[PDB]
Ligand binder design. Structure first.
Ligand code: ADP
Ligand code: BEF
Ligand code: MG
Length: 311
């Protein structure tokens, strides 16, 4: 999967924004409240509307002072270019239109009936929503979501790997993710933790950290460490699936991280994020600029986001 273009009109702080995304690490940098997460959440809305996420509401996200919201996304999947266009009219919903086209030769052609339901039906077959929310797009505040429970983790894993012996394949997959996560987390914590153990056990995927030679529960970690671990696991997952999904969208990776950890993050960008064909990384941390392949600066001007292509 590859994101080419996002166009947003009257979505939260964005009055009129166009962002071109490219291969490699695409860093979107800007201060608190400038419009970074609004762009990512516009991508989510663009792909999967109707959503049932409590903090994203049609009547809230229309930019104050405007009536019409417009989201347009161009992306590639499995060699085919796709375009989804959504127009929202606040307070109303019948006069609003949703279309999904594909590039067939030169002409763009509707892939289905231009309706939320049919598009959702197609999108779920193209890229399942759970894979997007759990494996592709890590929303702000959700870095540690994968540390939540053995069951939820089993659910995401099972969904992510899809369909001798299924169990052997599962063990091998989890083993590889565990290897990768261990390498990353050990780099992140300077050998404080020598392994991240990801283990299948009944309808559950256990997750432990090794400290002084023994497996420990996740409560063992400090807050910053849980951030590091979440990053490590999601990166391991993205790398394991690098050939299949090839995209990682990560909002603010720096919460609770001290100075050294923030420096290690750069090393991790350099060593690992560069192995994922496309990454969209959002942060207020300027230190992250040098390790990125493409930098987009966002700021708030007179009530509206302004986007500036740096590189
Ligand atoms: N409906 C709206 N109309 C105009 N501005 C909005 C609306 N909803 C939210 N905002 C503004 O959008 C700003 C950017 O939010 P966000 O993109 O979440 O910031 P960040 O760059 O920190 O992710 C907020 O600080 C808020 O003032
Ligand atoms: F306040 Be933002 F998410 F940088
Ligand atoms: Mg944000």
């Amino acid at each position: 999967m590859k994101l080419e273009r996002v166009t947003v009109k009257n979505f939260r702080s964005h009055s009129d924004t166009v962002v071109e995304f490219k291969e490699g690490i695409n860093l979107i940098i800007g201060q608190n409240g400038s419009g970074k997460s609004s762009l990512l959440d516009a991508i989510l809305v663009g792909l999967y509307w109707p959503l049932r996420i409590k903090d994203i509401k049609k009547d809230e996200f229309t930019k104050v002072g405007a009536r019409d919201t417009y989201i347009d996304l161009i992306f590639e999947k499995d060699g085919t270019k796709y375009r989804i266009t959504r127009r929202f009219l606040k307070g109303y919903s019948s006069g609003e239109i949703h279309a999904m086209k594909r590039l067939v030769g030169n002409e763009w052609k509707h892939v289905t009936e231009p309706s939320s339901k049919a598009i959702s039906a197609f999108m779920e077959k193209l890229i399942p929503y759970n894979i997007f929310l759990n494996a592709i797009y890590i929303r702000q505040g959700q870095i540690d979501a994968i540390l939540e429970s053995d069951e939820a983790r089993e659910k995401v894993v099972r969904e992510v790997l899809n369909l001798k012996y299924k169990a052997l394949a599962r063990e091998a997959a989890l083993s590889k993710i565990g290897e990768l996560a261990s390498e990353i987390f050990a780099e992140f914590t300077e050998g404080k933790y020598s392994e991240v153990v990801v283990r299948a056990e009944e309808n559950k995927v256990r997750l432990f950290v090794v400290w002084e030679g023994k497996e420990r529960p996740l409560t063992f970690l400090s807050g910053g460490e849980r951030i590091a671990l979440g990053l490590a696991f999601e990166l391991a997952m993205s790398l394991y699936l690098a050939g299949e999904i090839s995209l990682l969208i990560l909002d603010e990776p720096t919460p609770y991280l001290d100075e050294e950890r923030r420096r290690k993050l750069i090393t991790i960008m350099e060593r690992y994020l560069k192995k994922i064909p496309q990454v969209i990384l959002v942060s207020h941390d300027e230190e992250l600029k040098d390790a990125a392949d493409h930098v987009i600066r966002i700021s708030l001007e007179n009530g509206s986001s302004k986007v500036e292509v740096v590189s």
